[PDB]
Design a binder for this molecule. Structure first.
Ligand SMILES: Nc1nc2c(ncn2[C@@H]2O[C@H](COP(=O)(O)OP(=O)(O)O)[C@@H](O)[C@H]2O)c(=O)[nH]1
Lengths: 608, 221
């Protein structure tokens, strides 16, 4: 049994965290980094389950907020200390922290702790019990009014509550605290703990070769092919940190004693000559490199070239607060990775909450926080011109943002359903001259895909959904790929006119007077993957590669040129006599030409 | 306006925060350079990653003076307000701060005016960056003429020759093939006296640069 779990100590600046921790472990200065430790709890009950919490005393100061979402995991309990002294407003001051615990670890308990009980305002339990309980918050399970700097019955009850609430974790009835693991894993953990002492203090990092020498020097029967799984599991438990990603040159170095790494990385936010380049690489991996924090926080005046509501496309993104390192990762992700063309470097005017790439007066893109009146929420207004190049940019930006949300902040998309993230689309029936753009939820417009127009109560007015949300209707791509449903003669599913090889749902039909193969994407899946496919195939255009004739929204399908003789697999299995020597060479030459073209565009076809 | 202290006090009222003359009020508010309020513009340069590095693809000109005059940047921003177009139309992107404008049409038709401070120099500078292409040359001509006109019209004492002249217009050239850096700075009057030829040449005369791609306002380019 693996008796080890992460305890995370969240809170605001100045509020007692390291002092509460010093009085919780009975271990009788501003935090820099996250200050990892670990204390063993010898439970004296009949179930003497000796558990070891490893604490993560998160620093409250704002400049470090960019690196915290990297160290917030699911299998962990949270504390949240909030300085009772400035009552009735320090509770409403820690809602950003709780919202972030909700976004990152949506199903982890939270034990509210109120310090500074000596001075004063204990009626802050009112707002805690009314506004902070269930309204978009990460499932609070206890709340204590504790003192620090001295142990008492308050801290005793708080410590026992942390212990109890830890053991009864049960993510989907799993009992994290008592699960089973291969014995080699705990053996590997013990040898790392011993290696913590025998390593230079100025540089605690260890080498993959040194690890291999260590696992061989003792009787640990872990094979070479088993080490990735083992080392990644110890990473999840917060023993050692490592980054197996090959994009970095760090996979030969396995960070033991992680508190040193974290402190060293946060050193530059307040201000080994061999690993300078690796230092900078992981500095970018922590989102420290151009330092995305300390960017003057002040929007610079921008007089855009295009006014008029009928010449720009707006999209908002509403959420109660911006997540901790949201804007940093976004700026880094949008760093020239969204070009209008498929080259030219654009002008860029960064601040703390925006990018504003700008090619031309008709090929710009401005992302950036925009605050509205009578709305305490936060918004992410995106402005873009209505032309073709504009449509391309809007598609890329929305996909990048959506990907980031699904990858880092899943709790902001979990449906209960307000969903905590409502994507708006600003349209103006008002002929473009007038103003006050009517805002329409995106999912409602998605359900309005049955037609190709939007119409108000007075149906004499209309606006095409392309000039409102060109990411839904397939207009963001280059080269208009509309289906022109009149020409199609597709048959839905007769168990007939089928592609014959059941590779997907691809049928057979006639379009534009010629036979074609239609893959029916329509399913429970959304239109993300359809857009991903469509982009890759819309600009390759090589004779060896299959070419796309058209695509269509109603129903979701894409029309490809038909291969008369079918897959090569069937041909070789049943028609081996048909292959002459010249024909074999021609097939090989065409496939080689395709690989050459793909590798020219820096694409790996992988399975062939 | 009789009793001028009332006009001045009323006009300075809004810098700390008659329904007929509202439009005239705003007109003379612009005449006092109060209107977009050119003061209180956050004073902080926003990061700008220009499209073109490489010393052989941009044209720099400095303007050195011991301090910026009082209302210098306000009148300049107001004067440069879309009155310097590349073409003879299109409105350009603009990113103002307290000491710059940065009009930007295209990645090859931009113009960035703005204070730039140098090391080991207590003086103040007015570095102007512009692409080396044709459209760039047009913009540089208009901006230099606009700046020079403003100086001669409002601050004559900054041009009176005694003669350091308190205002030394530099031109940054780079004999270093564009790859290398540390642009050698040459006083403009000296280059004006170098109009006898159509090239500039260093101690090693195998290298040369045409004066067009350094100061295209002198040679008619
Ligand atoms: N008197 C008193 N002081 C407290 C209490 N809790 C915290 N403090 C003060 O809070 C300070 C500790 O701040 P700290 O948690 O280290 O800041 P952080 O590292 O940013 O989280 C100490 O100087 C304590 O005096 C309390 O219950 N009573």
């Amino acid at each position: 049994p693996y008796n080890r779990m992460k305890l995370m100590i969240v809170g605001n600046t100045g509020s007692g965290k390291t002092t509460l921790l010093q009085q919780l472990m009975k271990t009788k200065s501003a935090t820099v980094g996250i200050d990892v430790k670990d204390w063993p709890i010898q439970i004296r009950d009949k179930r003497k389950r000796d558990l070891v919490l490893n604490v993560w005393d998160f620093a409250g100061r704002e400049e470090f907020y960019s690196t915290h979402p990297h160290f917030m995991t699911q299998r962990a309990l949270y504390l949240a200390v909030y300085d009772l002294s400035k009552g009735q407003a320090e509770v409403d001051a820690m809602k950003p922290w709780l919202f972030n615990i909700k976004a990152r670890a949506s199903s982890s308990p939270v034990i509210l702790v109120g310090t500074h009980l000596d001075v004063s305002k204990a009626c802050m339990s009112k707002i805690t019990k009314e506004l902070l309980n269930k309204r978009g918050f990460p499932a609070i399970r206890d709340y204590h009014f504790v003192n620090a700097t001295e142990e008492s019955d308050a801290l005793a009850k708080l410590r026992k509550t942390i212990i109890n609430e830890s053991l009864n974790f049960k993510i989907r009835d799993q009992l994290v605290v008592g699960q089973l693991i291969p014995d080699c894993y705990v053996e590997l953990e013990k040898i790392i703990l011993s290696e913590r002492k025998n390593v230079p203090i100025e540089f605690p990092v260890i080498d993959r070769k040194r690890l291999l020498q260590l696992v061989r020097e003792n009787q640990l029967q872990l094979d070479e092919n088993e080490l990735p799984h083992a080392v990644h599991f110890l990473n999840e438990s917060g023993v050692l940190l490592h980054f197996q990603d090959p994009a970095l040159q760090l996979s030969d170095l396995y960070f033991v004693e992680p508190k040193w790494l974290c402190k060293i990385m946060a050193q530059i936010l307040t201000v080994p000559k061999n690993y300078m380049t690796q230092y900078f690489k992981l500095l970018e991996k922590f989102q420290i490199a151009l330092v995305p924090s300390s960017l003057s926080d002040h929007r610079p005046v921008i007089e855009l070239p295009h006014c008029e509501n009928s010449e720009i496309i707006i999209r908002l993104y509403e959420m109660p607060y911006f997540p901790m390192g949201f804007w940093s990762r976004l700026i880094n992700r949008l760093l020239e990775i969204s070009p209008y063309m498929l080259a030219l470097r654009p002008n860029r005017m960064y601040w703390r909450q925006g990018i504003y790439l700008n090619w031309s007066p008709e090929a710009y893109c401005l992302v950036g926080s925009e605050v509205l009146d009578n709305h305490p929420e936060s918004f992410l207004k995106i402005t873009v011109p209505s032309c073709r190049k504009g449509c391309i940019l809007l598609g890329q930006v929305v996909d990048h943002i959506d990907s980031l949300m699904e990858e880092w902040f899943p709790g902001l998309l979990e449906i209960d359903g307000e969903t905590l993230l409502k994507k708006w689309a600003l349209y103006s029936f008002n002929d473009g001259e007038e103003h006050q753009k009517i805002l329409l939820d995106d999912l409602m417009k998605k359900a309005e895909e049955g037609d190709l127009l939007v119409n108000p109560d007075q149906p004499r007015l209309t606006i095409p959904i392309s000039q409102i949300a060109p990411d839904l209707i397939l207009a963001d791509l280059p080269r208009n790929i509309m289906l022109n449903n009149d020409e199609l003669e597709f048959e839905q599913a007769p168990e007939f006119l089928l592609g014959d090889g059941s590779f997907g749902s691809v049928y057979r039909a006639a379009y534009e007077g010629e036979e074609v193969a239609v893959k029916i994407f329509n399913k429970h899946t959304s239109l993300r993957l359809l857009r991903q496919e469509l982009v890759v195939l819309c600009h390759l255009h090589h004779p060896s590669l299959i070419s796309l004739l058209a695509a269509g929204i109603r129903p979701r399908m894409l029309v490809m040129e038909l291969a008369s003789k079918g897959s090569l697999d069937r041909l070789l299995q049943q028609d081996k006599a048909s292959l002459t020597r010249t024909l074999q060479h021609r097939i090989a030459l065409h496939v080689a030409d395709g690989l050459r073209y793909l590798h020219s565009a820096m694409i790996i076809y992988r399975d062939l």
